[PDB]
Design a protein around this ligand. Structure first.
Ligand SMILES: *[C@@H]1[C@H](O)[C@@H](O)[C@@H](O)[C@@H](CO)[C@H]1O
Ligand SMILES: *[C@@H]1[C@H](O)[C@@H](O)[C@@H](O)[C@@H](CO)[C@H]1O
Ligand code: NA
Ligand code: NA
Ligand code: NA
Ligand code: NA
Ligand code: NA
Ligand code: NA
Lengths: 540, 537
């Protein structure tokens, strides 16, 4: 009665897919608050997930809850979770909160986190101790592995249709307040030769850590040791059940990071991705956690984490209104998923990170974008993997009260308007055709774009054939034109159809024509999925 | 079922109801709701409030409208309707005094001055305040009070009525004492031996013994004796707890007796009251001061080794709700907001200008923190260690000065406010810091709620374990003493509830929910917090 293929992350042609039930899949995700991982809290999780239209829930499973006393395992939460997820026909990503949760051992059992002699903490260069477990603690590694193995044996036994499609190993590893462990135990490894395997993979000359890496030795050392720790846990679990597994990064600012220890040292930050990929070959991907609000910073993060060797998964993102539009470039980069944080009614907000008020309007900002993708999820996922997709978001953030003042003053207003219109105009090269995406304009005539208030728009395009595209967009205009000069030919829209996929087959609902195609393709907040066919034609 | 009883032991107190400590999460009616037809306008509010006990008058005029012709028809209906709703009652005996006056004494009492005489001023004019030296008045009040207690003895065997208030706000406005010939004959004479013995003073006349306090202390003594005799007579029928409620003088700047209600249990005569009326179980403050400092001072003065704290009347406007927390943290046995019914009356500017669902909800939200643990809290308060705090700045009035202010005076002002909105509690090995009006994430300093509203309750369960619930506040734990090289953490925070006296865990708070203290909004959460120190060397 259970014949479904394991989920798997595939990588080729520099592109990636999360295979679920034997085909590409997109996680249109929701993630709970940090204290929702108990049976009694789930009634405060599912309603939000339904309102959001999410297909996949990310939720912790804590070491402390599965092994409250050493060797006495308790999977009562996982049992209820699996059953309730199945009732609602959603899938799960389990977050293993264990040796590290945001740098710290708070979710390790008391017999772990209160026994430093057995399970040692990072020691600073000055001799003081931080509440961050050292990745050189061999007992810690053994005990985390043992518990993780038991979790994976529970899923092997009790989740044969793979309700759980992926597992996050740890949560935001690293250390705040120091660059590495400086304990005697750590110093002995630091003072010794860099392991051959790393030297070989990075194509460097042999030496000790300080000799090989200079001023980067302390940070690279901590990243290597954490990555090896996480890889060993990962390998042990996959030996039981070979699900995709990943780590999530407490990001450093990519333009102005500050110093390791200010940001979480040793996690998969952009400067140690090479270390993590060398050190942890069994981990499937390294996922950014995004709480930067501004378009330029978010865009840079998506660029850094989308690599031929690294599928893009936005494992955590804020739940305030500005964040919703980042679904569009995430999917346009070939991303496999997107998981806004704090999507439950458990009476907590991490404002000022996320939304100040958690209510139906908060959820609706995400529901409105997920409604663009849900009706085509499998078709999009395949085109993303096997084809050409594009995706953009509105590239100016909302005007501040600062800019609000500097506007009341200003001939200057007119130039500013021109500059904003240009910035709110995006070009995409789709082969024989280009698209121009603009934001915040009427659905008729050609008044320049002025942006949405607040910033919110975006667009998704997939290429179906040389002259045919799937298009859906949000609070935006999409206009097509030839990509190269036509040698005396004219061009037009040949046909725009609005429709849907049913059992993989396109069903046309209506043709957009006349006013609906004279002024580009204009989208509001409501979902429309279009197939657009362009033509060039001779006039003699 | 066992009689309710007020216990006092080890300077602590409990109201025992059904053989265990109980907290009155009270509602009190308006003054004209003591009739069967009005009760339909009382119960819906009580239900919305989540109150467990109703305080309501029973008037001498209604039970004895004609001398010797008793009528308990209201008491019957009340008992039956209270039982239907599974709530308890505190009956307020409105008789010789209600707010200094005899308006609730039967017409055959209050219109017969020669039989039942009034206070006479020094100048010979008469006040509408019955003299405590009227022996007829004492006998008549006592007789009727006895009949009421007989009704409860015969008709309330399960003690729906758990306590009785004897009179309401006794004393006299407009004069310090009775200066009638009858009163002068007693005043111009020896202080009674018993009072001299209990205060350890030298024998003499009132004037000799007490000097410039004589007049006021005389009035307080004679009213206390009156109230004790009524009390004793009633308890001899049915030995319920019985108390008196005080029209407070301002504790910082009282003015003169007569301006405030002279002779009641004001803070300067609590020694007289305790000496003269040993059968009265407690003296309860009636609080209509809105401001934190005065309210706090009142709670301090009335919480004594010899006096259980019962807030027998408090305003029903929004600022008053948060005073439940310090009341319970002092080991108070109850709290009773006034005017909780829909009988088309507001005592604004004392209470709320508007009575509506929002008015009630400000109290419902704090009662919802206590109801789920009421019996457990009550036992901890008596037998153990509890604490409770309220947000210590009132709502900003001040906004003129904040407007005219340098961006140096302002940053100074926000720092001063942050410090004032930070409270420290010494819980033994561990301290708690309580702050008000800040996000649930990071450490931006407190700026207070608007309006002021927050508070916290803590009970100690063990050396390192506390029961915690709070409201629009952050609670953070730290070691109370330097740890000598050890570190510390929260070991475990559990949200849960008591079922059959047993703790049931619903979820564990961790991660974001414990990284930045324990953050509470308007919604109820009951936590068990276990702290640990641990070696790193
Ligand atoms: C991301 C992190 O993974 C998550 O558990 C939570 O701590 C949030 C903040 O609310 C982020 O730090
Ligand atoms: C307190 C008093 O006991 C009560 O009956 C009522 O008169 C109020 C005012 O509305 C307070 O004086
Ligand atoms: Na092209
Ligand atoms: Na449609
Ligand atoms: Na008590
Ligand atoms: Na202490
Ligand atoms: Na101390
Ligand atoms: Na609860």
């Amino acid at each position: 009665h259970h014949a479904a293929p394991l989920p798997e992350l595939l990588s080729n042609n520099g592109k990636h897919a999360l295979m679920v039930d034997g085909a590409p899949y997109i996680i249109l995700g929701s993630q709970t608050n940090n204290s929702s991982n108990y049976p009694d809290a789930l009634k405060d999780v599912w309603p939000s997930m339904e309102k959001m239209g999410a297909n996949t829930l990310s939720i912790p499973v804590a070491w402390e809850q599965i092994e409250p006393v050493e060797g006495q395992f308790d999977f009562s939460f996982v049992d209820v979770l699996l059953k309730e997820a199945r009732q609602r026909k959603v899938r799960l990503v389990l977050l293993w909160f264990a040796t590290w949760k945001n740098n710290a051992p708070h979710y390790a059992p008391a017999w772990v986190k209160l026994d430093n002699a057995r399970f040692p903490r990072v020691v600073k260069e000055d001799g003081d101790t931080l509440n961050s477990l050292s990745p050189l603690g061999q007992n810690t590694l053994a005990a985390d592995k043992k518990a993780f193995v038991e979790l994976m044996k529970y899923l092997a036994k009790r989740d044969k249709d793979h309700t759980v499609i992926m597992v996050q190993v740890q949560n935001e590893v690293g250390t705040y307040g120091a660059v590495r462990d400086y304990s005697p135990m750590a110093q002995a490894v630091f003072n010794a030769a860099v392991p051959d395997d790393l030297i070989q993979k990075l194509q460097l000359k042999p030496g000790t850590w300080s000799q090989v890496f200079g001023r980067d030795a302390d940070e690279f050392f901590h990243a290597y040791q954490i990555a090896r720790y996480c890889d060993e846990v990962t390998v042990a679990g996959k030996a039981i059940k070979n699900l995709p597994m990943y780590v999530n990064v407490a990001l450093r600012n990519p333009f102005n990071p500050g110093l390791p220890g200010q940001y979480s040292s040793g996690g998969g930050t952009d400067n140690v991705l090479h270390i993590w990929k060398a050190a942890a070959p069994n981990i499937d991907l390294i996922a950014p956690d995004i709480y930067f609000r501004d378009y330029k910073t978010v865009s840079k993060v998506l660029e850094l984490y989308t690599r031929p060797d690294n599928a893009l998964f936005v494992a955590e993102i804020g739940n305030d209104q500005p964040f919703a539009r980042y679904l569009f470039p995430t999917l346009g980069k070939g991303g496999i998923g997107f998981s806004p944080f704090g999507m439950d009614d458990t009476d907590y907000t991490n404002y000022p990170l996320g939304a100040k008020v958690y209510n139906d309007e908060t959820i609706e900002q995400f529901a409105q974008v997920y409604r663009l993708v849900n009706p085509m999820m499998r078709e999009w996922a395949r085109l993303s993997y096997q084809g050409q997709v594009w995706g953009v978001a509105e590239p100016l953030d909302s005007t501040t009260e600062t800019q609000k003042i500097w506007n009341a003053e200003a001939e200057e207003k007119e130039q500013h308007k021109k500059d904003r219109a240009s910035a709110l105009t995006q070009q995409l090269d789709l082969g024989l055709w280009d698209a121009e995406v603009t934001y915040g304009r009427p659905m008729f005539w050609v008044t320049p774009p002025e942006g949405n208030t607040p910033a919110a728009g975006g667009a998704l395009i997939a290429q179906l054939d040389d002259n045919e595209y799937l298009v859906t967009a949000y609070k935006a205009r999409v206009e097509f034109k030839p990509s190269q000069e036509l040698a005396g030919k004219k061009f037009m829209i040949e046909r725009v159809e609005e429709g849907r996929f049913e059992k993989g087959k396109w069903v046309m609902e209506r043709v957009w024509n006349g006013d609906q195609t004279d002024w580009g393709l204009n989208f509001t907040d409501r979902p429309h999925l279009l197939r657009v066919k362009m033509a060039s034609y001779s006039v003699q």
